[PDB]
Amino acid sequence: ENVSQQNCPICLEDIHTSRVVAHVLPCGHLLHRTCYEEMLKEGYRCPLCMHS
Ligand SMILES: [Zn+2]
Ligand SMILES: [Zn+2]
């Protein structure tokens, strides 16, 4: 399984290490701008913490 290539669990979309487009969460996770709003809206436990 291609786990070496990251994905956005916030909405099952694509994601990459480049944080110029992807906003950095203060816990070190990346998500596209809109998804930063979506996630921060909930303030829920960051699922990305399971994958690194
Ligand atoms: Zn997303
Ligand atoms: Zn985290």
From Swiss-Prot:
Disulfide bonds: none annotated. Induction: Up-regulated during the S phase of the cell cycle. Expressed at low levels during G phase. It is found in: Nucleus; Nucleus speckle; Cytoplasm. A zinc finger (RING-type) spans 8-52. Subject to ubiquitination and proteasomal degradation. Interaction with PLAGL2 or KAT5 enhances protein stability. E3 ubiquitin-protein ligase that mediates ubiquitination of target proteins, including p53/TP53, TP73, HDAC1 and CDKN1B. Mediates ubiquitination and degradation of p53/TP53; preferentially acts on tetrameric p53/TP53. Catalyzes monoubiquitinates the translesion DNA polymerase POLH. Involved in the ribosome-associated quality control (RQC) pathway, which mediates the extraction of incompletely synthesized nascent chains from stalled ribosomes: RCHY1 acts downstream of NEMF and recognizes CAT tails associated with stalled nascent chains, leading to their ubiquitination and degradation. Monomer and homodimer. Interacts with AR, MDM2, KAT5, PLAG1, PLAGL2, COPE, UBE2D2 and GORAB/NTKLBP1. This is RING finger and CHY zinc finger domain-containing protein 1. The chain holds residues 138 to 189 of 261 of the full protein.
